[PDB]
Amino acid sequence: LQEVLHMNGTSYAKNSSYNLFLIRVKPVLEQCIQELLRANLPNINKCFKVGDLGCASGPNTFSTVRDIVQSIDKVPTIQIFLNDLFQNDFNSVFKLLPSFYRNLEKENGRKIGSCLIGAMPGSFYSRLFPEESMHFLHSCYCLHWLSQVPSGISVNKGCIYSSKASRPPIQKAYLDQFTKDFTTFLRIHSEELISRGRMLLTFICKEDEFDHPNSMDLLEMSINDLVIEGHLEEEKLDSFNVPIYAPSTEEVKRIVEEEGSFEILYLETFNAPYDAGFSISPVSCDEHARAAHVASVVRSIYEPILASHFGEAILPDLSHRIAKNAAKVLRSGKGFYDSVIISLAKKP
């Protein structure tokens, strides 16, 4: 998937929003960075070296950089490495850099050349940076993507991942894959961090106490509609497996403590409404448009993988079922994407 997985190049950019997860991350990001400067890590007041792991493209890429930069300058050279898979749309980010830099100088006074933005492409499940070279690593909404479909060909009937309705051997196969992946992530990136360096990670979580469908759940139920309706053969659904896990906070916690590289400074979950990134009639129109927006966001996350497995002909039917499902969920008051945020410091 290293050379297959990426967000939609409509686009992830057009459908993304600061208002979904990044605004919840921001205060925690801010506190993390301020604590780092106060900790006086070697060279941090000369050059603050930061990586954004799974930056994608679009406004969110720039919004995350802005948040970092403003956090650092809140009342040092900044070297930012943007990381994503080798077929991410880097060219478009780089073309927006000249205006980004000017706007940075008009906004903050940050002289041009004092914030140095480059890219380091590759999988965050492999080494990206020299040993003990980085102060801070940030990733938002990436770590639920696995390095591969769980290494357990086997039939996950009526399901596309370890959903609540999936059988326990599937659930165990997906957990074991996440464990491998996340342990590797932690082992590798701890080595890249300067002593007492930090990571701030935000990704999908599963909460036993709630019952809120995540984007994969909305997708799964919508593919199911289509087989029931007759539009898709049951074999297409039975063969489709997404390389994505939704962990519990206890699972996240056990993995980190097992790895041993990091102390947990902060660990919380939060629930983001589906349409938090949506802006504005009767009211059936209002809710139609909100549901249609949700479906666009969900299509923008999964289209590459959906097109390779199913072909392009079912995607408009799929978008239609996702919207219908989205609206029913929001009406029941369970229309939230559940997310965990965890702040880690490298142990001496």
Ligand X SMILES: Cn1cnc2c1c(=O)[nH]c(=O)n2C
| Residues of this chain that bind a second copy (CB under 8 A) | 2-3, 46-47, 49, 77, 79, 81, 86-91, 94-95, 97-98, 112-113, 116-122, 126-131, 133
Looking at residue 145, the DSSP 8-state letter turns out to be B
Binding partner at 251 among ligand SAH, ligand X, a second copy, none, C-beta below 5 to 8 Å by kind? none
Q: Does 20 bind ligand X (CB under 6 A)?
A: yes
Q: Does 182 bind ligand SAH (CB under 6 A)?
A: no
Cα dihedral sign, 60-85-152-189? negative
Closest distance to ligand SAH from the beta carbon of 202 (Å): 8
Closest alpha carbon to 234 in 243, 224, 242, 222: 224
Binding partner at 199 among ligand SAH, a second copy, ligand X, none, C-beta below 5 to 8 Å by kind? none
Closest distance to ligand SAH from the beta carbon of 344 (Å): 17
Q: Does 162 bind ligand X (CB under 6 A)?
A: no
Looking at the DSSP bridge assignments, the partners of residue 273 are 336
Binding partner at 217 among a second copy, ligand SAH, ligand X, none, C-beta below 5 to 8 Å by kind? none
Out of 125, 129, 141, 174, the residue judged to bind ligand X by CB under 6 A: 141
Q: What are the tokens at 280? A: 């504005």
Segment 207-246, which members bind ligand X (CB under 6 A)? Answer: 214-215
Rounded distance between C-alpha atoms, residue 161 and residue 170, angstroms: 8
Q: What are the tokens at 266? A: 């902060």
**Was 315 annotated as part of a binding site?**
no
With contacts defined by CB under 6 A, name the span among 40-48, 49-57, 211-219, 284-292 that binds ligand SAH: 49-57
Q: Does 337 bind ligand X (CB under 6 A)?
A: yes
Nearer to ligand SAH (CB atom), residue 23 or residue 267: 23
Rounded distance between C-alpha atoms, residue 224 and residue 234, angstroms: 8
Annotated binding site for Mg(2+): 156, 238, 240-241
Annotated binding site: 12, 21, 55, 60, 84-85, 123-124, 140-142, 144-145, 156, 215, 238, 240-241, 337
